[PDB]
């Protein structure tokens, strides 16, 4: 279950919410594992992975959208995308697919 997996990230996984921070994390090429939402605007969607061709990070498309990623991470607002710049104790970054 992936919804077992990403709930464990909040312990010590260095992650970041937001979009510009998601981009700025992806700017240095140090961050991995972009997580997106289903009902994002698709013109916003493409330049996430178009950078991510160049940093080679996996972008797992999440089967839910924006409004149901919020309770799926813990916070109470409509969090669009999620970058996991470090997941020091985890299982996502290897065992996905």
């Amino acid at each position: 279950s992936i919804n077992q997996k990403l709930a464990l990230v909040i312990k010590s996984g260095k992650y970041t919410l937001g979009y510009k921070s998601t981009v700025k994390s992806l700017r240095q090429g140090k961050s991995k594992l972009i997580i997106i939402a289903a009902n994002t605007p698709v013109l916003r969607k493409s330049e996430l992975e178009y950078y991510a061709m160049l940093s080679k990070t996996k972008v797992y498309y999440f089967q839910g959208g924006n409004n149901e990623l919020g309770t799926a991470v813990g916070k109470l607002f409509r969090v669009g995308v999620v970058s996991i710049l470090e997941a020091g104790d985890s299982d996502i970054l290897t065992t996905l697919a």
Partner: protein, 91 residues
Amino acid sequence: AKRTKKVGITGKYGVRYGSSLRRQVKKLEIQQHARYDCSFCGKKTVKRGAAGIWTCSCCKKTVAGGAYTVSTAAAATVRSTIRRLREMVEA
């Protein structure tokens, strides 16, 4: 808080026009301009502009949905009628 007890929504008429009628308009006109949640924005700020229009205040993207609600009873069966159908005409 809860100002009056039963009529509520269409209390603005008063005592005229009937009451079998204005408890059917009560059931509809609550739906007519209550703020729905259009799905391609992740918010709930879409409301009436005209009988057939809906318009989200953020994201500025106006659907052409139903008359009084955002999607009718017959609208959710047509989008699965062709999604019944769009597979086996290909495969």
